[PDB]
Amino acid sequence: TASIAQARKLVEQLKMEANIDRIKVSKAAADLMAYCEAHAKEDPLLTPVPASENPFR
Amino acid sequence: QSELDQLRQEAEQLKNQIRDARKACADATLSQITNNIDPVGRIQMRTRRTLRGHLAKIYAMHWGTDSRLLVSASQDGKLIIWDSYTTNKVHAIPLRSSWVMTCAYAPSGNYVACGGLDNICSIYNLKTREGNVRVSRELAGHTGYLSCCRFLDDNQIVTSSGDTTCALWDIETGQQTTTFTGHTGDVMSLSLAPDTRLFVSGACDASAKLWDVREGMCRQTFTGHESDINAICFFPNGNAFATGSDDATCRLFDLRADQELMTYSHDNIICGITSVSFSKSGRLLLAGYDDFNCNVWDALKADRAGVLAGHDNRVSCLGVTDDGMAVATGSWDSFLKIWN
Amino acid sequence: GCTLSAEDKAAVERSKMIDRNLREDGEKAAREVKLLLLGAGESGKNTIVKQMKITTGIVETHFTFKDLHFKMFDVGAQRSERKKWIHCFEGVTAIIFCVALSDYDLVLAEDEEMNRMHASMKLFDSICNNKWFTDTSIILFLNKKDLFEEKIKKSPLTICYPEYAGSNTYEEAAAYIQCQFEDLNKRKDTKEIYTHFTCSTDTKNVQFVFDAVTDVIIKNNLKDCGLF
Amino acid sequence: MVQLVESGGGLVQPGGSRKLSCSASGFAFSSFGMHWVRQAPEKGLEWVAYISSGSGTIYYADTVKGRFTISRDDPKNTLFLQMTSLRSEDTAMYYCVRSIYYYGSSPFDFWGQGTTLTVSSSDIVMTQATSSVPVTPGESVSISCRSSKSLLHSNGNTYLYWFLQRPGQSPQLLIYRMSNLASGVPDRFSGSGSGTAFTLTISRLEAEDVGVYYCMQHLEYPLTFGAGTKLEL
Amino acid sequence: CCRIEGDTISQVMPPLLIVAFVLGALGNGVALCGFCFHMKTWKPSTVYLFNLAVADFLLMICLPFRTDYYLRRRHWAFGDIPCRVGLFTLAMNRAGSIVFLTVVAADRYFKVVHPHHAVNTISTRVAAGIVCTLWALVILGTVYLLLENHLCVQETAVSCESFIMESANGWHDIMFQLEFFMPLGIILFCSFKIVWSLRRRQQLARQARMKKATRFIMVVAIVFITCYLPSVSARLYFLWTVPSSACDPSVHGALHITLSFTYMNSMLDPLVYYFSSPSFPKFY
Ligand SMILES: O=C(O)c1cc(O)cc(O)c1
């Protein structure tokens, strides 16, 4: 009866996690790619900016 | 002990059902979709600043929200707040316990937190009526070493400890509000979501968990590594996160798909990862390594795009400003560098 | 700073003062002697730290001897995994390991099969051969000598070491225990072990620690001079 | 808890010498720079001297240079000003002002209750054209200050300070660096400007906002105050 | 003047000086390259080695000025003032290489016999003040090298020399004897005490590293003995029987041999100090 509480809680957690909804991998990948090219102009690390507006020049 | 055996069997069958659902939901891969787009060019990043003054190994750092100030923690018993533009030192806070290995900077800029082997999270008031920095609170509810801490606002902070638990604190009252349990292993890192409604953690059981702050419950569990997880970071979108382990690999997980997406590894690399971070657009993934180097990965194609090599010891911490202009690396050689 | 405004120059001056204070504190802290104290609960760490100086995770004890300041750290309260924080103590001057002679036959409460002496030997082997302590001296203390005298007459040492073939007298048994502990070191040439038997010694363990620390300091000085 | 008390003064024969002292309590005295600021009767403020934290840097006004000296006593938390060859126009009230300098600090944020000294018988010019404005409660008012030289530095910030002196009291900081509010100032004061012309706006004027308003530049030494602008009912 | 008229010196010196110049410059250059470019932290006991290497380098710089002088039969072909700074870095850089032999040998005595002494923990900004008050007293010692004349002219050739003959008083003789003998006593005392103290460490001695470190203490002392004894002894013998020795050609043959032996101290110092040390950096 000592180890039955932890096991019952684990079974409850597994039951709760088994009821989550899942989307297809293609949709998640496409959303990530859409975000990646949809913000490319605002990221200075891969697109260097001229030394006029670079505070670390 | 038949009840224990049947509970074990039920847990195993539930795990098998979850795995089967994940497999059935898995169609194609990220690489197959991403192969259409053109690859990113070679990344040539150069050291712009070098911050000196720490006299021992540096364990943690955190950028301010203004992308100018930052705080660094060293085991010489000192917290230093730097002005990254002029290299000037703003504050130097002496620590009661020198065994600090985490630090955080409040989003309002008014407070700094640190902790370590003393099992205590200390809060420091930067804006005082006097001219000095004072301790405003000490949180002493943990039974293991503090590994990470992150502010939510001026009154809430989330900490992770070696007692395999995470806790949410009320700073003004100094009491724990919620306790997050379930890891069964040393929790090493934390990462807050941009909306602050959720956070993820990584522990020595080679698993990652997603928690709901309001409800104090574990929603999802991710298991793809075969060794201890040392660092974790949310994707800027808020629907993904990356993990760095001691098996010399990094992985990308998706919350909605509830499984792994891509792995970043190389045969020439055999050392463990100490820190990870994302760029503002999320295209670049920066990871620190034990081989004294920091690698820049292409988050969409799993192709290395550059190397930051300016340290002669282990790279312990990473950081990218909120505006994405600069990247900072700390190291065991007692130097911080700003790369751009 | 010819291109700096008055406020910028004042900020630079403040940063210079902060740098000076940091340098002075760092020089002040470089003259301290730091010791990492390890062992088990019943080994006798409390007795040793009491003799030295006449839920928290780490305890710091400060004492002085012959104008030299010592800092001792006890990490016995940390029940988490050792490999995740042991690297923080890399660079310590020396390690102090406490062992009780009288616990050669007693068994641990947690595990019946496991013996206390073999558990201590396993811990010593793990710490001595650690990759963060490949050049760190070890000071080994044997803590319960009179109880060893009492228990050796009423019980042989062969119960702990089945292969012990020698007289059950105190001297041979103590030598066998010491050599068994010292055989765990593998570097041999790189690092050395200091051993000292303690029952109720008064202001003699501190002298032993002082001598070992002096040897370590001389080695560091010779490394600094390049004559090494 | 912050407090600054000065001692010294009284009637002085011309050509004599005295030493003014100020005592600090309630804050880390050694971490703050110290200024002496002078105000003659029915006249505006005038900077005198400055000693840095750690005594590394010392400046003086050209009027008092050679005759006045400034020093600190950090263990005793005291500030000194030894004056020699006192003349007629040194008769004024002397204030002691604390200031701390780092990224984002607020200099000149606390003024002491100065003492009165009576003696018997290029630089940037900051100008305020208006000298008096009649006001009534509930009305919005604007105060203007103009600078001979542009106060906009190449680092991106403008060094303009606004102070208020209520009748019978010590000056109080309102706006620092032309846009930032002080710690305990209501959100009815606003500041703005461009290079050489600056304005201070007081929305929903109340009976508490009656006094003299001074503008200051902190771009370079010596520090110069503008003329006063009095608000009356 | 007096006319030795001996070509054996003119045929023996160029070998020794050429060998010294060609084997002594690259080692000191490598040591200088490694001291600054290949190091990160400047703690004491490193500044003194740097200054000794600099003194050796300065000797090597001015050494070739006399490898052709002896080839043309002791003729100073070019210059009259240039033989005032050509014998100035032969008493500035020859006496600034014996002082830093007494400094490196007195710094090792305070790290083996007095490990907790305060001198062991001084900052780099304090030793920089000692190497800047010894290296200046070295100059102050040899002002007359620039405030006197040395050229002596003969029928066919001019000879510029300072260790010439007779009974040179109070300078280039007395300073010579003191700067040899006095540092020697300190070096011998320090070397004996260091070994005596280091042998009493019964458990440190079992390591071969200690044995190598103790052998290198005596190596430096014997090298210093065998490289400067002839130079002092020859001048002493000349000074004693100077009545009879009216600049005898045999005598002048020997003193030029012994100074070439002194010139090999800066040859041997790099190889003894920097190259035979595991802890110093590598040059591939
Ligand atoms: O090194 C010298 O000072 C020196 C001086 C001489 O007169 C001759 C010589 O061969 C060397």
The CATH code of the domain that includes D168 is 2.60.40.10
C-alpha of residue E160 to centroid of ligand 1, in Å: 9
The contacts of residue D183 (CB under 8 Å, 6+ apart) are B129, D106, D109
CB atoms B280 and A45 under 8 Å: yes
**Residue A12 near chain B (CB below 8 Å):** no
Tokens 């009821």 map to which residue?
A: A19
Q: Residue D208: which of D222, D193, D189 has the closest Cα? A: D189
Domain that holds residue D58: 3-119
Give the count of beta carbons closer than 10 Å to the beta carbon of residue B253: 24
SS (H, E, C) D86-135: CCHHHCEEEEEEEECCCCCCCCCCEECECEEEEECCCCCCEECCCCEEEC
CB C148: neighbour CB atoms within 10 A? Answer: 22
Helix H or strand E encompassing D170: none
The Cα of D182 is separated from the nearest Cα of chain B by a number of Å equal to 12
Which residue, among E102, E185, D163, has the nearest Cα to E110 in the 3D structure?
E102
Q: Distance between CA atoms of B70 and E101, rounded to whole angstroms? A: 48
Rounded Cα distance, E41 and C24, in Å:
17
What are the Cα distances from residue B294, in Å, to B329, D3, E147?
8, 52, 62
Q: Burial level of C121, CB count in 10 A (0-12/13-18/19+)? A: middle
> Among D54, D86, D119, which residue terminates a domain?
D119
Atom of ligand 1 nearest to the CA of E163: 7
Largest CA distance in chain C: 86
DSSP state of D152: B
* CATH topology (fold) of B2-339: Methylamine Dehydrogenase; Chain H (2.130.10)
Q: Which residues line ligand 1 (CB under 6 A)?
A: E 87, 90-91, 161-163, 256, 259
Q: How close A19 gets to chain B, by Cα (Å)?
A: 9
Strands C137-142 vs C193-197: parallel, antiparallel or unpaired: parallel
**Solved with:** cryo-EM
Provide the shortest C-alpha distance from residue B89 to chain C (in Å): 5
Termini Cα distance of chain D: 33
Smallest Cβ–Cβ distance between A18 and the set B18, B40, B48 belongs to: B18
The Cβ-side half-sphere exposure at D90, using a 13 Å CA radius, reads 28
The chains found to touch D (3+ Cβ pairs under 8 angstroms) are B, C
How many angstroms separate the CA atoms of E198 and D179, rounded?
A: 70
Q: What is the DSSP code (8-state) at residue B95?
A: P
Compute the distance between CA of residue D112 and CA of residue C169 in angstroms, rounded to an integer: 83
Q: Could you say which of B92, B117, B163 has the minimum Cβ distance to residue C85?
A: B117
Strand, helix or coil for residue E174? helix
The DSSP letter of residue D158 is B
Which of A22, A28, A42 is opposite residue B21, by nearest beta carbon?
A22
- What are the residue ranges of helices labelled H in B212-297? none
Sheet (strand B69-74) strand order? B58-63, B69-74, B78-83, B89-94
> How big is chain C, counted in residues?
228
Q: Give C133's contacts (C-beta < 8 A, 6+ positions apart).
A: C90, C95, C127, C191
In the block, tokens 């074990």 appear at B8
The answer to whether the CB atoms of B30 and A25 lie below 8 A apart is: yes
Which top CATH class is C33-217? alpha beta
Rg (CA), chain D: 18
Q: What is the CA radius of gyration of chain A?
A: 24
Query: Which DSSP symbol is given to E204?
Result: T
Pick the CATH number of E7-275 from 1.20.58.340, 2.60.120.10, 1.20.140.10, 1.20.1070.10: 1.20.1070.10
Between CA C198 and CA C47 the distance in angstroms is 10
Count of domains observed in chain D? 2
Q: Do the beta carbons of residue D153 and residue D168 sit within 8 Å?
A: no
Single out the residue in D66, D84, D119 at which a domain terminates: D119
Residue E227 host element (H or E): helix E208-240
Q: By the CB < 8 Å criterion, does B4 face chain A?
A: yes
CA–CA separation, D10 and B300 (whole Å): 79
- D51 and D95 together in one domain: yes
Angle among Cα D30, D34, D37 to the nearest 5 degrees reads 160
Dihedral, CA of residue C85, residue C86, residue C87 and residue C90, to nearest 10: 140
Residue numbers in C near B55 (CB within 8 A): 22, 26, 29
**Separation CA D95–CA B247 (nearest Å):** 66
At C205, list the tokens.
């363990």
Of the candidates B61, B56, B47, B54, which has an alpha carbon nearest to the alpha carbon of residue B277?
B61
Do E108 and C31 count as a contact with CB atoms less than 8 A apart? no
* Distances, alpha carbon B132 to alpha carbons B8, B135, D30, D32, D100, in Å: 57, 10, 10, 10, 11
Q: Residues D101, D200: one domain? A: no
Note whether residue D135 is domain-resident: yes
Amino acid in position B162: G
Is there a contact between B68 and B86 (Cβ–Cβ < 8 Å)?
no
Say if D213 falls within a structural domain: yes
CA E162, E167, E171, E176 torsion: positive or negative? positive
* Residue D18 and residue D110 in one domain: yes
Tokens of D129: 């054209």
Longest CA pairwise span in chain D (Å): 51
How many Cβ atoms sit within 10 Å of the Cβ of residue D133? 13
Nearest to C68 among E116, E198, E280 (CB): E116
Q: Are residues D13 and D53 in the same domain?
A: yes
Beta strands in E32-189 (DSSP E): 151-153, 158-160
Same domain, D94 and D135: no
Q: Which of D209, D230, D217 is closest to D140 using CA atoms?
A: D209
Helix (H/G/I), strand (E/B), else coil: B20: helix
- DSSP tag of E120: G
Task: Assess contact for E113 and C222: CB atoms under 8 A.
Answer: no
Tokens (6 digits) for B307: 């190397």
Q: Where are the domains positioned within chain E?
A: 7-275
CB E13 within 8 A of CB E165: no
Edge-to-edge strands, sheet with B259-264: B229-234, B240-245, B250-254, B259-264
C213 by Cβ neighbours in 10 Å (0-12 / 13-18 / 19+) ranks as: buried
Mutate to test the pocket of ligand 1, among E16, E71, E162 (most ligand atoms within 8 A of CB): E162
Nearest CA in chain B to D102: B90
Last residue of a domain, one of D59, D88, D119: D119
* SS3 readout for chain C: CCCCCHHHHHHHHHHHHHHHHHHHHHHHHCCCEEEEEECCCCCCHHHHHHHHCCCCCCEEEEEEECCEEEEEEECCCCCCCHHHCHHHHCCCCEEEEEECHHHHCCECCCCCCCEHHHHHHHHHHHHHCCHHHCCCEEEEEECCCHHHHHHHHHCCHHHCCCCCCCCCCHHHHHHHHHHHHHCCCCCCCCCCEEEEECCCCCCCHHHHHHHHHHHHHHHHHHHHHCCC
Nearest residue to D74 via CA among D46, D47, D52, D99: D52
Structural domain contains residue D232: no
Domain contains D233: no
Sign (positive/negative) of CA torsion E86, E87, E89, E90? positive
User: How far are the Cα atoms of B16, B183, E169 from residue E175, in angstroms, in the given order?
Assistant: 94, 79, 10
Pairwise CA distance, residues D199 & D158, whole Å: 13
Distance of alpha carbon C213 from alpha carbon C33, whole angstroms: 8
| Interchain CB distance below 8 Å, D57 and C10 | yes
Q: Residue C148 and residue C8: Cα distance in Å, rounded?
A: 71
Cα B256-B196-B208 angle, rounded to 5 deg: 50
Taking CA C65 as the corner, what is the angle to CA C29 and CA C123, rounded to the nearest 5 degrees?
75
Contact criterion met (CB < 8 Å) for C227 and E121: no
- Specify the DSSP element, H or E, that contains E279: none
Sheet of B134-139: strands edge to edge? B100-105, B111-116, B121-125, B134-139
Rg of chain B over CA atoms, in angstroms?
A: 20
- The residue in chain A having the minimum alpha-carbon distance to the alpha carbon of residue B50 is A56
Phi, psi of D61 (to 5 degrees): -80, 150
The residue type of B154 is: D
What's phi and psi for E116, nearest 5 deg? Answer: -100, 10
Supply φ then ψ for residue D17, to 5 degrees: -140, 140
Q: Which residues pair with D132 in a beta bridge?
A: D230
Q: How many CB atoms lie within 10 A of CB E233?
A: 13
CB burial of residue B2 (10 Å; 0-12, 13-18, 19+): exposed
State whether D26 and D98 are in the same domain: yes
| D134 and D105 in a common domain | no
SS3 state of residue B331: strand
Distance CA B142, CA B163 (A): 7
Q: Any long-range contacts for B193-196 (C-beta under 8 Å, 24+ apart)?
A: B193/B234, B193/B238, B194/B234, B194/B236, B194/B238, B195/B238, B196/B152
Q: Quick one: which of B142, B95, B22, B67 has its CA closest to B324? A: B67
Closest ligand 1 atom to Cα of E94: 1
A and E adjacent (3 or more CB pairs under 8 angstroms): no
For residues D138 and D210, membership in a common domain is answered with yes
Distance from the B65 Cα atom to the nearest Cα atom in chain D, whole angstroms: 14
Give, using CA atoms, the residue closest to atom 1 of ligand 1: E90
* Touch criterion met for A and B (3+ Cβ pairs within 8 Å): yes
Tokens 């956070």 belong to which residue?
B199
d(CA C47, CA C142): 12
| Tokens describing residue D183 | 């710690």
C15 to chain B: which residues are within 8 Å by CB? 88-90
Chain C residues closer than 8 Å to B163 by CB: 80
**Rounded to the nearest 10 degrees, how much is the dihedral formed by the CA atoms of C99, C104, C105, C111?**
50
Using alpha carbons, select from B161, B151, B207 the residue that is nearest to residue B183: B207
Ordered domains of chain A (ranges, CATH)? 4-56 (4.10.260.10)
**Cis (ω within 30 of 0) for the bond into D167?**
no
Q: Which residue has the tokens 């305060």?
A: E118
Instruction: Tell me the three-class secondary structure of B258-274, residue by residue.
Output: CEEEEEECCCCCCCCEE
* Gap between the Cα atoms of E59 and E50, Å rounded: 14
Would strands D33-39 and D92-99 be described as parallel, antiparallel, or unpaired? antiparallel
**Burial level of B286, CB count in 10 A (0-12/13-18/19+)?**
buried
SS (H, E, C) D33-89: EEEEEEECCCCCEEEEEEECCCCCCEEECCCCECCEEEEEECCCCEEEEEECCCCHH
Residue B252 pairs with which residues in a beta bridge? B242, B262
Q: How far is CA B10 from the centre of its chain?
A: 34
Q: What angle do CA E228, E229, E231 make, to 5 degrees?
A: 70
Please, what is the Cα angle at D71 between D69 and D74, to 5 degrees? 175
